[model samples]
Target: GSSGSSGLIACVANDDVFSESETRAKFESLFRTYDKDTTFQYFKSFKRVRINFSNPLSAADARLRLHKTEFLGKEMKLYFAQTLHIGSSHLAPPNPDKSGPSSG
Candidate 1:
């Protein structure tokens, strides 16, 4: 699983061959474009983007967001990635609250 801070952005490349650095660079480049234009309203709507070539979630949750996409080898696959945390805070507490159940 991946973790990120609140208000911060995150992304992953679905291509298995791509390195993390390369994926991060791609996201940064996209962010630059998204930041420069108010015309791109949807860009600011999400806190993160997780890209995976396969279903990342379980069978139940995975049923909702799957989409078919063609890969480099002309292979068709479902891309069940996401771009937000639903309702949780992306930014971790500076000092975690250890009193209650640990946040998953």
Candidate 2:
């Protein structure tokens, strides 16, 4: 009777989607907390502070989820989110554009 009398099928899903504008606002709020001239280590500390306060999933998970949910078809909006990992690793340098003289 496994074919005709099959058990119920249940699918569980976690709904974690937000409007683009809303997500942008949240990202901006977090980004602005860090100083405009903040260093890479400072940015990392800021992210830790955020994790301590908000206690959401890891920043990577949040970012990837946002990308999957809202950024897949709209990569242009990715800049609005201000990813901390990229900001810390790539853009957090004293001379991000390499236009200024090296400080050594």
Candidate 3:
């Protein structure tokens, strides 16, 4: 229902062995087509990164291609986040849900 959306793509991986520079480069390269700078923010303590795209189309495109993809020998996930894009804020980690299910 909305048009011309600007949203933040939240990306996370299981491993935290990668450095900030490498992390930034990885995303910047992947999303270079949109522009010269990908506008990435890395949070090392949380092992999370946020990528913002002025157009939602590009944001969604990046997410579908990235979610559950392997990066640095670790599986990465991408999801949409509605938060302040200009300033920094602490976001609670996503719910911890494992793949396996159990019958009650």
The number of the candidate with the highest lDDT is 3
Evaluate all candidate structures by whole-model CA lDDT and list the values in order: 0.33, 0.28, 0.64
RMSD for each model, in Å, please?
13.6, 20.2, 15.5
* Candidate 3 Cα lDDT to native: 0.64
* Model 3: residue 74 alpha-carbon error in angstroms: 1.2
Q: How would you encode candidate 3's per-residue C-alpha lDDT over 16-74 as one tens digit per residue?
A: 43465465466556666665545777677776777767666787777766777776566
How far is 31's C-alpha from truth in model 1 (Å)?
2.1
Report the lDDT tens digits of candidate 1 across residue range 1-104: 44532122122225432435453453334334333321111122333243322222232232232223223333223332344458766886597564754655
Is 1 or 2 the stronger prediction by TM-score? 1
Error of 3 at 80 (Å): 0.4
Sliding window of 10 residues with minimal summed lDDT for model 1: 36-45
Off by over 4 Å in 2: 1-57, 71-73, 76-104
Q: In candidate 1, residue 31 scores what lDDT?
A: 33
Question: How many Å off is the CA of 65 in candidate 2?
Answer: 1.9
Error of 2 at 63 (Å): 2.7
Backbone Cα, N, C clashes tallied per candidate: 4, 0, 0
Select the stronger candidate by TM-score from 2 and 3.
Answer: 3
Pairs clashing in candidate 1?
A: 5-90, 5-91, 6-90, 6-91
